[PDB]
Symmetry: D3
Subunit: 181 residues, 6 copies
């Protein structure tokens, strides 16, 4: 059942069951982050280069190109076999891709999403995949930002919206605020 | 496109596994053991299963009794609520059936889904068993197992000397 | 009164982290919840005296256990991490003022305080955890500073 | 300002008094909780007293401090084995949890006047009490914050029947 | 280093750096316990059979018999390769053996060590190896008993001895209990 | 006969690793990360070492300094006191040197034991705990016949030949 496979530059991981594709300029360290994510119990699908294909009108599947399966490159140290170092519960052949966390250089040209309200999207072979964009700032904990992006995406999809919750009690809060006397 | 099975549907390391078979106050309590260890509950007690590919079952959460389990002594708990979003999931494909108290199959909608029957006795750390069941199924499908390791060993013994 | 900064329960000890701008207090709090600790409140923490010795901090009746992460938006901690991650209140015991001995009166009460310089690629989560652990150690006997110094002092007194 | 029997721990910040039979093995559950990030206050001999009309407090006796005995290993010093995250001098008790060898509506117990919510749990042979007690504690804080789950399931089941 | 090798029936793990040899009977669950232990960050050296050898007069090294290297048997489902399931951080080719934790069926005929006073010992090639005997009671958490045994054993080695601390306050404490009227 | 070296001696997954070459960062801060992640401290700052046989070096803790760390901001902390017995070790053979600098496969003699060494190109951002962890894990894997060049070869042959 083998359809077309385009190719994408990033890191595909599976965080709490969600396929999350990390993209970015180098000098951020997508893959250092990959590794820290596998220390924390998540699954590596592909490093650096990721095969994707369409499967439904609303579903993409990502995988590593067979040749690179299980392989991870640490600019510096060398190349490792993640399965050998971390075992089978650390790697997966594929996942659907629910979310792109695009890693962006913190320049104060333009701005970022401060409510979680934005709904940016990135088209991959017909499917618009939900995307988000976090500032990079040398020694942010990125693993954790990605972990939270993932958790918060599943929450919203399930009807727990934090953004909405806060728009909803903005007035009550302002009312309690001003009462600073 | 619908159906219903008795069991627990967990996502262990990204792999969907269906635990069938009551007793030991198992299942519920075990679904729990699994969540505090970082895995995901899809559905306790009753699971709605349908069919994707010609070899893919998907299991889903009911839109009602959704991510709840019941523990005798404290009642009904809400997993999402107590554990947060990393503990609950909605979907997975079903890759392995782990049936409580060799290697087998069990078809549901003419999909021969891999199955394994664990001979159970009373003390048992079941969480770790299911965990290891899952890892090994993922290891097997990638070319690895005890018997290849054991032959590597026999070979090193016979020869390097 | 009511105060700015992040209130966490780190291994049971209420610590007020009162760091600067940039270097996000909030990601720090996030990592602390991830590590098993509790958010009481981020910004606008409601503190109010109780004993001439002890000091409480609690969460506003509204929009408690919310947090803003740049890029991610508004996140709900109880939601994302479940119930072992939030707590309605705690007696504050130590304030960690991030940077980039000492004290701080709140309702006049003297509250112990510490300052970490922070530096290019420093994990605050861990330093803050350690400050808290060490506080409870100092507070229970066990000095380490004072012990090192005596052991050093007698080390110097030795010679031949 | 009296004294009591049971294990006092701070589980994710909630003071929980563990009371239980003998063979249910309290101290060892104490130890498991310690290993999972929680604090021992006192194992047996907990010094409890009142604070306010509502609030009970439990503290470590000046001397047993963070010692406990494990059958076969003898006397172990919690702070010494696990370090400073594993012990605490005092906590408000919020919930008593009573383990049970015995096996056949909500509960309560009295300290210094105060009614103290009590939960009882049957130890079925081979169950994990660390996990159960953790969950009880988290669930007690969910309830206490408005999220019932029991009341919501019932209310959701109701409108379901009506949906005919 | 090619010295004499005896064979012992048990489970050699490295807990927190210390080699511990777990002995006992069938039904105590030596190897399921092994597995929990490796879930928890420890390292398996040998399941079921352990090669031991003397190395100096206070030191014993244990290893897996090469043919059984990395292998572990779970009566539940067969035999697994622990390196493949758990990665390199989970296995180790050898360790010195500091401590024997012998698992005993709880039968009411023997009293058990209630202080950490006892200083039992088991001889292995002339080396008297320290040893502790814990009761098994199906459903108990052996993983943690063993971990605490390890930790307590290093604590005592280093001068922290909960038993002496207790003795030296036996009286202060007793004074304080009657001080409850 | 004992010598003595500058660095941090840690036990990571049972492998003795010596981190040399203070990236101003604070190897003592990195030793810190490692103990909160489950590994063991033998000695910070200065480490006493000795030979044990050709091909084997041991690494021990001085009887004074002894499981202490200085963290700039809070001062001197006792690792055994704050973290407990699982966080510290009296000695350990040294199998690997990791040199933090602010193909390779290098060596470094200590008493005429060539001791495997690895240098890390370091820029500021680096999670170093994870790098050291990974180094440790990989040295072990390598010692056992696994590489990544072998993995890459396996993959190459799978792709060339279309399955197995």
């Amino acid at each position: 059942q083998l359809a077309e496979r385009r190719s994408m530059h990033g890191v595909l991981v599976d965080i709490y069951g969600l396929g999350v594709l990390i993209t970015g300029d180098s000098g951020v360290g997508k893959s250092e982050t990959a590794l820290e994510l596998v220390q924390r119990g998540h699954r590596l699908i592909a490093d650096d280069r990721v095969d994707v294909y369409q499967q439904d009108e609303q579903t993409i599947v990502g995988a590593a190109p067979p040749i690179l399966s299980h392989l991870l490159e640490i600019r510096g140290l060398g190349i490792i076999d993640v399965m050998n170092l971390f075992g089978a519960g650390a790697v997966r052949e594929d996942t659907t891709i629910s979310l792109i966390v695009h890693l962006e250089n913190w320049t104060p040209d333009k701005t970022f999403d401060r409510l979680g309200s934005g709904e940016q999207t990135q088209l991959i072979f017909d499917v618009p995949v939900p995307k988000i964009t976090v500032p990079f700032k040398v020694g942010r904990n990125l693993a954790i930002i990605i972990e939270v992006a993932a958790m918060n995406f599943r929450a919203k999809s399930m009807g727990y919206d934090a953004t909405k919750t806060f728009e909803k009690n903005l007035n009550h809060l302002i009312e309690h605020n001003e009462e600073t006397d």
